[PDB]
Amino acid sequence: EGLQLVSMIREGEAAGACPEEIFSALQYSGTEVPLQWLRSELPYVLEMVAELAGQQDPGLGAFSCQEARRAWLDRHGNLDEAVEECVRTRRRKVQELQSLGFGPEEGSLQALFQHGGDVSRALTELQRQRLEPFRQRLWD
Amino acid sequence: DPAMQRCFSAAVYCAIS
Ligand SMILES: *CC(=O)Nc1ccc(NC(=O)C*)cc1
Ligand SMILES: [N]
């Protein structure tokens, strides 16, 4: 097993080469790309999905790795479909929280990011952030 | 380059699966 490839690919990461460029060059060279490296670059793809979703709709806040992973898996790695589903899913949750008196101005966008897009965990965090201002104003 | 990102995403999913 010629493990020369992954060490050279790990050189490219050290020098700062783009994973897509490493992959595209290997495919143009007819070289078998090590599946272990592709699988290990999943976090890079999910960060790619998340920031593309942020570019697609500023004002929905930052997208979590958990939300990008669900969209990306559900769309079978189709990058454009994953970003669109990522955006549509988040907009639904921002509206769901909005319907409970928690809009973007109240910090719902940041609570959805901090909790991977779980509406239940975000609602509990937002309730706490309403309770602490009262605790410190009621005592002072 | 946008084609390269799309290829990478699809390739990484094939590898994962
Ligand atoms: C350009 C593009 O989409 N390429 C591409 C190459 C290979 C694969 N499949 C595997 O790596 C298994 C998908 C897409
Ligand atoms: N796979």
Tab-separated table of N, CA and C and ligand atoms in Angstrom:
chain	number	residue	atom	x	y	z
A	1	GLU	N	0.818	-1.210	0.000
A	1	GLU	CA	0.000	0.000	0.000
A	1	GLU	C	0.853	1.262	0.000
A	2	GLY	N	0.895	1.934	-1.147
A	2	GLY	CA	1.649	3.162	-1.284
A	2	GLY	C	1.063	4.317	-0.497
A	3	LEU	N	1.420	4.410	0.783
A	3	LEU	CA	0.968	5.491	1.651
A	3	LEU	C	1.672	6.817	1.364
A	4	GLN	N	2.442	6.906	0.272
A	4	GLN	CA	3.054	8.176	-0.108
A	4	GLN	C	2.009	9.256	-0.362
A	5	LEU	N	0.833	8.870	-0.866
A	5	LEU	CA	-0.188	9.848	-1.235
A	5	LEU	C	-0.637	10.686	-0.043
A	6	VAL	N	-1.025	10.030	1.054
A	6	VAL	CA	-1.634	10.759	2.163
A	6	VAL	C	-0.617	11.644	2.868
A	7	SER	N	0.652	11.235	2.902
A	7	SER	CA	1.676	12.111	3.460
A	7	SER	C	1.881	13.337	2.577
A	8	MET	N	1.882	13.146	1.255
A	8	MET	CA	1.946	14.284	0.344
A	8	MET	C	0.702	15.153	0.464
A	9	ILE	N	-0.473	14.527	0.584
A	9	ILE	CA	-1.694	15.298	0.786
A	9	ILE	C	-1.638	16.038	2.116
A	10	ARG	N	-0.994	15.439	3.124
A	10	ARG	CA	-0.829	16.104	4.413
A	10	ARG	C	0.208	17.219	4.333
A	11	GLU	N	1.151	17.107	3.396
A	11	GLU	CA	2.021	18.229	3.060
A	11	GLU	C	1.215	19.399	2.516
A	12	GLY	N	0.323	19.118	1.561
A	12	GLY	CA	-0.517	20.159	0.991
A	12	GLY	C	-1.328	20.906	2.029
A	13	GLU	N	-1.820	20.188	3.043
A	13	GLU	CA	-2.516	20.843	4.143
A	13	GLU	C	-1.567	21.743	4.923
A	14	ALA	N	-0.332	21.285	5.146
A	14	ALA	CA	0.652	22.105	5.846
A	14	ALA	C	0.966	23.368	5.051
A	15	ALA	N	1.269	23.212	3.759
A	15	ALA	CA	1.522	24.372	2.912
A	15	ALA	C	0.286	25.253	2.778
A	16	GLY	N	-0.903	24.679	2.953
A	16	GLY	CA	-2.133	25.438	2.859
A	16	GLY	C	-2.831	25.320	1.520
A	17	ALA	N	-2.847	24.117	0.955
A	17	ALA	CA	-3.515	23.874	-0.313
A	17	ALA	C	-4.983	23.542	-0.088
A	18	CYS	N	-5.809	23.950	-1.038
A	18	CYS	CA	-7.243	23.730	-0.920
A	18	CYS	C	-7.564	22.252	-1.117
A	19	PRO	N	-8.429	21.666	-0.282
A	19	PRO	CA	-8.785	20.248	-0.477
A	19	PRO	C	-9.413	19.952	-1.829
A	20	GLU	N	-10.258	20.849	-2.351
A	20	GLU	CA	-10.824	20.637	-3.680
A	20	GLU	C	-9.730	20.588	-4.738
A	21	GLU	N	-8.740	21.479	-4.631
A	21	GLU	CA	-7.653	21.503	-5.604
A	21	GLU	C	-6.816	20.231	-5.546
A	22	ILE	N	-6.502	19.757	-4.337
A	22	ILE	CA	-5.824	18.472	-4.198
A	22	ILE	C	-6.650	17.372	-4.856
A	23	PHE	N	-7.962	17.357	-4.596
A	23	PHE	CA	-8.815	16.302	-5.149
A	23	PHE	C	-8.913	16.405	-6.669
A	24	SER	N	-9.162	17.612	-7.186
A	24	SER	CA	-9.309	17.797	-8.628
A	24	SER	C	-8.032	17.431	-9.374
A	25	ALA	N	-6.874	17.782	-8.813
A	25	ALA	CA	-5.612	17.423	-9.449
A	25	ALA	C	-5.404	15.914	-9.452
A	26	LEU	N	-5.727	15.247	-8.342
A	26	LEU	CA	-5.599	13.796	-8.299
A	26	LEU	C	-6.512	13.131	-9.320
A	27	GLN	N	-7.696	13.700	-9.546
A	27	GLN	CA	-8.621	13.120	-10.511
A	27	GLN	C	-8.142	13.359	-11.939
A	28	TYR	N	-7.541	14.525	-12.200
A	28	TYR	CA	-6.970	14.787	-13.519
A	28	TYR	C	-5.731	13.935	-13.784
A	29	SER	N	-5.030	13.514	-12.731
A	29	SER	CA	-3.855	12.659	-12.866
A	29	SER	C	-4.204	11.180	-12.974
A	30	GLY	N	-5.489	10.828	-12.961
A	30	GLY	CA	-5.894	9.436	-12.901
A	30	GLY	C	-5.444	8.692	-11.665
A	31	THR	N	-5.130	9.406	-10.585
A	31	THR	CA	-4.675	8.795	-9.344
A	31	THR	C	-5.874	8.471	-8.459
A	32	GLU	N	-5.890	7.259	-7.907
A	32	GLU	CA	-6.924	6.886	-6.949
A	32	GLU	C	-6.815	7.745	-5.697
A	33	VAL	N	-7.878	8.473	-5.385
A	33	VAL	CA	-7.878	9.340	-4.204
A	33	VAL	C	-8.172	8.494	-2.972
A	34	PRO	N	-7.348	8.570	-1.927
A	34	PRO	CA	-7.581	7.745	-0.730
A	34	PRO	C	-8.882	8.136	-0.047
A	35	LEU	N	-9.790	7.161	0.071
A	35	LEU	CA	-11.097	7.426	0.666
A	35	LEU	C	-10.976	7.897	2.109
A	36	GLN	N	-9.942	7.440	2.822
A	36	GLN	CA	-9.721	7.881	4.196
A	36	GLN	C	-9.511	9.388	4.281
A	37	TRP	N	-8.879	9.985	3.267
A	37	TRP	CA	-8.683	11.432	3.281
A	37	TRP	C	-9.977	12.171	2.971
A	38	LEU	N	-10.742	11.684	1.990
A	38	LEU	CA	-12.016	12.314	1.652
A	38	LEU	C	-12.961	12.306	2.846
A	39	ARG	N	-13.086	11.154	3.513
A	39	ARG	CA	-13.942	11.070	4.693
A	39	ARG	C	-13.473	12.026	5.781
A	40	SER	N	-12.157	12.142	5.962
A	40	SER	CA	-11.594	13.020	6.979
A	40	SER	C	-11.760	14.498	6.651
A	41	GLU	N	-12.161	14.839	5.425
A	41	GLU	CA	-12.420	16.219	5.038
A	41	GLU	C	-13.905	16.558	5.071
A	42	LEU	N	-14.709	15.739	5.745
A	42	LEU	CA	-16.115	16.077	5.936
A	42	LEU	C	-16.321	17.375	6.716
A	43	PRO	N	-15.613	17.641	7.826
A	43	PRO	CA	-15.803	18.940	8.501
A	43	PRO	C	-15.529	20.131	7.605
A	44	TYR	N	-14.577	20.011	6.678
A	44	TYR	CA	-14.329	21.092	5.731
A	44	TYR	C	-15.537	21.322	4.827
A	45	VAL	N	-16.159	20.242	4.348
A	45	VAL	CA	-17.328	20.380	3.485
A	45	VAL	C	-18.487	21.005	4.250
A	46	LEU	N	-18.659	20.626	5.520
A	46	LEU	CA	-19.761	21.170	6.307
A	46	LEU	C	-19.546	22.648	6.613
A	47	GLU	N	-18.305	23.046	6.894
A	47	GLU	CA	-18.009	24.468	7.032
A	47	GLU	C	-18.238	25.205	5.719
A	48	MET	N	-17.978	24.532	4.591
A	48	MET	CA	-18.288	25.099	3.284
A	48	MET	C	-19.791	25.281	3.106
A	49	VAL	N	-20.582	24.276	3.494
A	49	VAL	CA	-22.038	24.390	3.415
A	49	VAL	C	-22.540	25.538	4.283
A	50	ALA	N	-21.974	25.692	5.483
A	50	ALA	CA	-22.515	26.650	6.442
A	50	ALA	C	-22.266	28.092	6.012
A	51	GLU	N	-21.050	28.404	5.559
A	51	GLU	CA	-20.771	29.783	5.168
A	51	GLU	C	-21.442	30.141	3.847
A	52	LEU	N	-21.597	29.172	2.938
A	52	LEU	CA	-22.382	29.423	1.731
A	52	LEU	C	-23.836	29.708	2.079
A	53	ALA	N	-24.361	29.038	3.110
A	53	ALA	CA	-25.709	29.339	3.579
A	53	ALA	C	-25.777	30.738	4.179
A	54	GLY	N	-24.724	31.149	4.891
A	54	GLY	CA	-24.679	32.505	5.416
A	54	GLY	C	-24.631	33.557	4.324
A	55	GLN	N	-23.885	33.282	3.248
A	55	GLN	CA	-23.867	34.197	2.110
A	55	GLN	C	-25.229	34.246	1.430
A	56	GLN	N	-25.907	33.100	1.347
A	56	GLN	CA	-27.191	33.033	0.659
A	56	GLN	C	-28.256	33.872	1.354
A	57	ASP	N	-28.210	33.957	2.683
A	57	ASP	CA	-29.193	34.730	3.443
A	57	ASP	C	-28.550	35.322	4.684
A	58	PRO	N	-27.887	36.469	4.550
A	58	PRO	CA	-27.504	37.220	5.745
A	58	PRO	C	-28.770	37.637	6.483
A	59	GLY	N	-28.683	37.678	7.802
A	59	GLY	CA	-29.835	37.960	8.623
A	59	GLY	C	-30.497	36.735	9.209
A	60	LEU	N	-30.086	35.538	8.798
A	60	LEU	CA	-30.457	34.314	9.489
A	60	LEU	C	-29.350	33.863	10.425
A	61	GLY	N	-28.319	34.690	10.592
A	61	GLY	CA	-27.242	34.404	11.504
A	61	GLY	C	-26.282	33.368	10.959
A	62	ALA	N	-25.482	32.842	11.876
A	62	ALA	CA	-24.466	31.858	11.549
A	62	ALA	C	-25.057	30.458	11.631
A	63	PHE	N	-24.606	29.584	10.736
A	63	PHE	CA	-25.132	28.231	10.636
A	63	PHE	C	-24.198	27.266	11.351
A	64	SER	N	-24.779	26.389	12.162
A	64	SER	CA	-24.010	25.451	12.961
A	64	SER	C	-23.569	24.255	12.124
A	65	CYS	N	-22.532	23.564	12.614
A	65	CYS	CA	-22.087	22.334	11.964
A	65	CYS	C	-23.182	21.277	11.971
A	66	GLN	N	-23.995	21.240	13.030
A	66	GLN	CA	-25.073	20.260	13.109
A	66	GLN	C	-26.115	20.495	12.024
A	67	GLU	N	-26.490	21.757	11.797
A	67	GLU	CA	-27.499	22.064	10.787
A	67	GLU	C	-26.975	21.810	9.379
A	68	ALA	N	-25.711	22.155	9.125
A	68	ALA	CA	-25.112	21.871	7.826
A	68	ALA	C	-25.028	20.372	7.574
A	69	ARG	N	-24.684	19.599	8.607
A	69	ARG	CA	-24.554	18.155	8.451
A	69	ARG	C	-25.881	17.510	8.065
A	70	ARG	N	-26.985	17.967	8.659
A	70	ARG	CA	-28.287	17.382	8.349
A	70	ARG	C	-28.700	17.688	6.914
A	71	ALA	N	-28.602	18.955	6.510
A	71	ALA	CA	-28.905	19.322	5.130
A	71	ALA	C	-28.018	18.561	4.151
A	72	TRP	N	-26.708	18.531	4.416
A	72	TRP	CA	-25.769	17.892	3.497
A	72	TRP	C	-26.039	16.397	3.368
A	73	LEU	N	-26.291	15.718	4.490
A	73	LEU	CA	-26.603	14.291	4.435
A	73	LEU	C	-27.913	14.045	3.698
A	74	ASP	N	-28.951	14.820	4.029
A	74	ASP	CA	-30.265	14.607	3.425
A	74	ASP	C	-30.245	14.827	1.917
A	75	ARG	N	-29.362	15.693	1.428
A	75	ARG	CA	-29.264	15.984	0.006
A	75	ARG	C	-28.140	15.215	-0.673
A	76	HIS	N	-27.544	14.241	0.020
A	76	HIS	CA	-26.573	13.315	-0.570
A	76	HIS	C	-25.363	14.046	-1.147
A	77	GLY	N	-24.889	15.063	-0.434
A	77	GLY	CA	-23.694	15.766	-0.842
A	77	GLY	C	-23.872	16.743	-1.980
A	78	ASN	N	-25.073	16.853	-2.544
A	78	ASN	CA	-25.352	17.875	-3.545
A	78	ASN	C	-25.198	19.244	-2.897
A	79	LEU	N	-24.125	19.958	-3.248
A	79	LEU	CA	-23.746	21.157	-2.503
A	79	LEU	C	-24.813	22.243	-2.603
A	80	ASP	N	-25.324	22.494	-3.809
A	80	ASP	CA	-26.302	23.566	-3.973
A	80	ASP	C	-27.621	23.225	-3.292
A	81	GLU	N	-28.066	21.971	-3.406
A	81	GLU	CA	-29.284	21.551	-2.719
A	81	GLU	C	-29.108	21.577	-1.206
A	82	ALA	N	-27.909	21.243	-0.721
A	82	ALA	CA	-27.659	21.253	0.717
A	82	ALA	C	-27.736	22.665	1.285
A	83	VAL	N	-27.138	23.639	0.593
A	83	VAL	CA	-27.208	25.029	1.042
A	83	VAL	C	-28.650	25.523	1.056
A	84	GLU	N	-29.421	25.199	0.016
A	84	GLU	CA	-30.800	25.676	-0.049
A	84	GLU	C	-31.650	25.065	1.056
A	85	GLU	N	-31.508	23.760	1.282
A	85	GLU	CA	-32.232	23.119	2.373
A	85	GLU	C	-31.761	23.643	3.723
A	86	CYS	N	-30.456	23.891	3.860
A	86	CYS	CA	-29.929	24.498	5.079
A	86	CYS	C	-30.610	25.833	5.365
A	87	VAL	N	-30.714	26.690	4.346
A	87	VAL	CA	-31.321	28.005	4.532
A	87	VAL	C	-32.806	27.868	4.853
A	88	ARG	N	-33.530	27.070	4.059
A	88	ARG	CA	-34.967	26.907	4.277
A	88	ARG	C	-35.271	26.338	5.657
A	89	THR	N	-34.479	25.367	6.115
A	89	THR	CA	-34.721	24.788	7.434
A	89	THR	C	-34.531	25.824	8.537
A	90	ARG	N	-33.466	26.626	8.445
A	90	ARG	CA	-33.191	27.626	9.473
A	90	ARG	C	-34.266	28.704	9.500
A	91	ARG	N	-34.668	29.198	8.322
A	91	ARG	CA	-35.735	30.192	8.248
A	91	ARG	C	-37.022	29.691	8.893
A	92	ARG	N	-37.312	28.390	8.777
A	92	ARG	CA	-38.499	27.846	9.432
A	92	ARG	C	-38.369	27.921	10.944
A	93	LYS	N	-37.170	27.656	11.457
A	93	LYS	CA	-36.970	27.642	12.898
A	93	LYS	C	-36.972	29.046	13.466
A	94	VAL	N	-36.361	29.979	12.738
A	94	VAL	CA	-36.397	31.380	13.124
A	94	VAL	C	-37.836	31.881	13.161
A	95	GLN	N	-38.680	31.412	12.235
A	95	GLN	CA	-40.093	31.790	12.288
A	95	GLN	C	-40.817	31.070	13.419
A	96	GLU	N	-40.504	29.792	13.654
A	96	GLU	CA	-41.110	29.088	14.784
A	96	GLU	C	-40.810	29.800	16.099
A	97	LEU	N	-39.549	30.186	16.308
A	97	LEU	CA	-39.194	30.926	17.515
A	97	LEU	C	-39.843	32.303	17.526
A	98	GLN	N	-39.929	32.944	16.358
A	98	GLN	CA	-40.604	34.233	16.256
A	98	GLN	C	-42.048	34.137	16.730
A	99	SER	N	-42.737	33.051	16.373
A	99	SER	CA	-44.118	32.850	16.793
A	99	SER	C	-44.259	32.680	18.300
A	100	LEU	N	-43.155	32.507	19.026
A	100	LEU	CA	-43.170	32.414	20.480
A	100	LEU	C	-42.553	33.650	21.130
A	101	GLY	N	-42.577	34.782	20.428
A	101	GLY	CA	-42.074	36.026	20.975
A	101	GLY	C	-40.571	36.152	21.034
A	102	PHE	N	-39.837	35.359	20.255
A	102	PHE	CA	-38.372	35.390	20.238
A	102	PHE	C	-37.909	35.599	18.798
A	103	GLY	N	-37.757	36.861	18.404
A	103	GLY	CA	-37.287	37.193	17.081
A	103	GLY	C	-35.782	37.351	17.029
A	104	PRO	N	-35.252	37.653	15.841
A	104	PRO	CA	-33.803	37.893	15.726
A	104	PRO	C	-33.289	38.986	16.649
A	105	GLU	N	-34.092	40.024	16.905
A	105	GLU	CA	-33.659	41.107	17.783
A	105	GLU	C	-33.525	40.654	19.234
A	106	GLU	N	-34.257	39.614	19.628
A	106	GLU	CA	-34.188	39.076	20.981
A	106	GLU	C	-33.075	38.052	21.158
A	107	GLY	N	-32.336	37.739	20.103
A	107	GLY	CA	-31.243	36.798	20.188
A	107	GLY	C	-31.556	35.381	19.763
A	108	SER	N	-32.602	35.174	18.959
A	108	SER	CA	-32.962	33.821	18.545
A	108	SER	C	-31.945	33.264	17.559
A	109	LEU	N	-31.387	34.129	16.709
A	109	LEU	CA	-30.409	33.692	15.718
A	109	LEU	C	-29.181	33.085	16.383
A	110	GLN	N	-28.714	33.709	17.465
A	110	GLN	CA	-27.529	33.216	18.157
A	110	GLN	C	-27.836	31.972	18.986
A	111	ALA	N	-29.058	31.865	19.512
A	111	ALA	CA	-29.431	30.679	20.276
A	111	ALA	C	-29.581	29.459	19.376
A	112	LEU	N	-30.043	29.655	18.138
A	112	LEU	CA	-30.126	28.543	17.198
A	112	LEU	C	-28.738	28.066	16.786
A	113	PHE	N	-27.795	28.996	16.621
A	113	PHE	CA	-26.421	28.618	16.302
A	113	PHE	C	-25.781	27.849	17.451
A	114	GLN	N	-25.901	28.372	18.674
A	114	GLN	CA	-25.236	27.772	19.826
A	114	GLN	C	-25.748	26.374	20.147
A	115	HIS	N	-26.934	26.011	19.665
A	115	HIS	CA	-27.563	24.747	20.024
A	115	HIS	C	-27.854	23.887	18.798
A	116	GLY	N	-27.056	24.045	17.743
A	116	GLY	CA	-27.152	23.193	16.571
A	116	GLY	C	-28.487	23.203	15.865
A	117	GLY	N	-29.309	24.222	16.091
A	117	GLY	CA	-30.591	24.317	15.427
A	117	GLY	C	-31.740	23.616	16.111
A	118	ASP	N	-31.543	23.095	17.318
A	118	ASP	CA	-32.640	22.497	18.068
A	118	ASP	C	-33.512	23.610	18.638
A	119	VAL	N	-34.780	23.638	18.223
A	119	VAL	CA	-35.701	24.672	18.688
A	119	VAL	C	-35.941	24.542	20.189
A	120	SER	N	-36.037	23.311	20.694
A	120	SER	CA	-36.305	23.121	22.117
A	120	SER	C	-35.155	23.644	22.977
A	121	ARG	N	-33.912	23.284	22.639
A	121	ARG	CA	-32.783	23.785	23.421
A	121	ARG	C	-32.624	25.297	23.280
A	122	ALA	N	-32.942	25.848	22.107
A	122	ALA	CA	-32.831	27.291	21.915
A	122	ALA	C	-33.897	28.043	22.705
A	123	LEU	N	-35.119	27.505	22.762
A	123	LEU	CA	-36.179	28.156	23.527
A	123	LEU	C	-35.836	28.228	25.010
A	124	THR	N	-35.285	27.147	25.568
A	124	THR	CA	-34.914	27.154	26.980
A	124	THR	C	-33.799	28.154	27.253
A	125	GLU	N	-32.848	28.278	26.323
A	125	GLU	CA	-31.768	29.245	26.494
A	125	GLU	C	-32.287	30.675	26.413
A	126	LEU	N	-33.274	30.919	25.549
A	126	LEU	CA	-33.824	32.263	25.412
A	126	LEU	C	-34.647	32.650	26.635
A	127	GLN	N	-35.376	31.689	27.208
A	127	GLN	CA	-36.124	31.944	28.435
A	127	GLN	C	-35.196	32.364	29.569
A	128	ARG	N	-34.061	31.672	29.714
A	128	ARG	CA	-33.085	32.037	30.738
A	128	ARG	C	-32.567	33.459	30.533
A	129	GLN	N	-32.301	33.843	29.281
A	129	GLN	CA	-31.780	35.172	28.974
A	129	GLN	C	-32.818	36.269	29.164
A	130	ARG	N	-34.090	35.909	29.315
A	130	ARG	CA	-35.124	36.844	29.736
A	130	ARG	C	-35.230	36.923	31.249
A	131	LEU	N	-34.848	35.848	31.943
A	131	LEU	CA	-35.026	35.757	33.387
A	131	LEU	C	-33.898	36.446	34.145
A	132	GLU	N	-32.674	36.377	33.631
A	132	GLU	CA	-31.539	36.955	34.340
A	132	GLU	C	-31.577	38.483	34.376
A	133	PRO	N	-31.936	39.177	33.282
A	133	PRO	CA	-32.133	40.635	33.394
A	133	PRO	C	-33.099	41.037	34.492
A	134	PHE	N	-34.164	40.261	34.701
A	134	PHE	CA	-35.107	40.582	35.766
A	134	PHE	C	-34.480	40.331	37.132
A	135	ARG	N	-33.731	39.237	37.266
A	135	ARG	CA	-33.138	38.908	38.555
A	135	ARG	C	-32.189	40.006	39.022
A	136	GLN	N	-31.404	40.572	38.107
A	136	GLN	CA	-30.431	41.575	38.509
A	136	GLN	C	-31.023	42.977	38.557
A	137	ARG	N	-32.144	43.210	37.873
A	137	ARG	CA	-32.844	44.481	38.003
A	137	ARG	C	-33.772	44.488	39.209
A	138	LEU	N	-34.375	43.336	39.533
A	138	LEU	CA	-35.265	43.240	40.685
A	138	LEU	C	-34.493	43.338	41.994
A	139	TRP	N	-33.236	42.886	42.007
A	139	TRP	CA	-32.408	42.959	43.204
A	139	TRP	C	-31.675	44.289	43.331
A	140	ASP	N	-31.392	44.965	42.221
A	140	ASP	CA	-30.701	46.246	42.302
A	140	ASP	C	-31.646	47.406	42.007
B	1	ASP	N	-13.813	26.867	-10.194
B	1	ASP	CA	-13.695	26.631	-8.757
B	1	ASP	C	-15.020	26.262	-8.071
B	2	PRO	N	-16.118	26.974	-8.363
B	2	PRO	CA	-17.416	26.494	-7.862
B	2	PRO	C	-17.739	25.081	-8.320
B	3	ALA	N	-17.300	24.691	-9.519
B	3	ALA	CA	-17.441	23.302	-9.941
B	3	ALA	C	-16.581	22.366	-9.103
B	4	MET	N	-15.424	22.849	-8.649
B	4	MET	CA	-14.524	22.036	-7.839
B	4	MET	C	-15.110	21.800	-6.451
B	5	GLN	N	-15.736	22.826	-5.866
B	5	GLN	CA	-16.412	22.653	-4.581
B	5	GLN	C	-17.575	21.671	-4.691
B	6	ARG	N	-18.339	21.745	-5.782
B	6	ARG	CA	-19.449	20.815	-5.964
B	6	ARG	C	-18.950	19.384	-6.133
B	7	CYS	N	-17.892	19.191	-6.930
B	7	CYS	CA	-17.306	17.861	-7.082
B	7	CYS	C	-16.796	17.325	-5.755
B	8	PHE	N	-16.118	18.169	-4.976
B	8	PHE	CA	-15.574	17.711	-3.706
B	8	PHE	C	-16.689	17.254	-2.777
B	9	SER	N	-17.733	18.075	-2.636
B	9	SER	CA	-18.859	17.718	-1.777
B	9	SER	C	-19.459	16.377	-2.182
B	10	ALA	N	-19.696	16.183	-3.481
B	10	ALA	CA	-20.242	14.912	-3.949
B	10	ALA	C	-19.271	13.767	-3.695
B	11	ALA	N	-17.979	13.996	-3.938
B	11	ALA	CA	-16.988	12.948	-3.718
B	11	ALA	C	-16.877	12.584	-2.242
B	12	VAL	N	-16.926	13.579	-1.354
B	12	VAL	CA	-16.834	13.286	0.072
B	12	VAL	C	-18.048	12.487	0.534
B	13	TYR	N	-19.226	12.754	-0.041
B	13	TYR	CA	-20.403	11.972	0.334
B	13	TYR	C	-20.286	10.532	-0.144
B	14	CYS	N	-19.800	10.331	-1.369
B	14	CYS	CA	-19.583	8.973	-1.852
B	14	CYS	C	-18.618	8.219	-0.944
B	15	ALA	N	-17.544	8.883	-0.510
B	15	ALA	CA	-16.582	8.243	0.380
B	15	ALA	C	-17.210	7.913	1.727
B	16	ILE	N	-18.010	8.831	2.268
B	16	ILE	CA	-18.656	8.589	3.554
B	16	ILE	C	-19.572	7.376	3.465
B	17	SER	N	-20.284	7.241	2.352
B	17	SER	CA	-21.263	6.177	2.184
B	17	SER	C	-20.621	4.890	1.685
C	1	LIG	C1	-16.997	16.430	-10.618
C	1	LIG	C2	-17.636	15.389	-9.742
C	1	LIG	O1	-18.763	15.531	-9.291
C	1	LIG	N1	-16.856	14.324	-9.545
C	1	LIG	C3	-17.117	13.202	-8.816
C	1	LIG	C4	-16.111	12.246	-8.781
C	1	LIG	C5	-16.283	11.070	-8.070
C	1	LIG	C6	-17.458	10.837	-7.366
C	1	LIG	N2	-17.599	9.616	-6.694
C	1	LIG	C7	-16.734	9.105	-5.820
C	1	LIG	O2	-15.709	9.669	-5.463
C	1	LIG	C8	-17.136	7.746	-5.320
C	1	LIG	C9	-18.483	11.779	-7.409
C	1	LIG	C10	-18.307	12.963	-8.123
C	2	N	N	-19.931	4.849	0.433
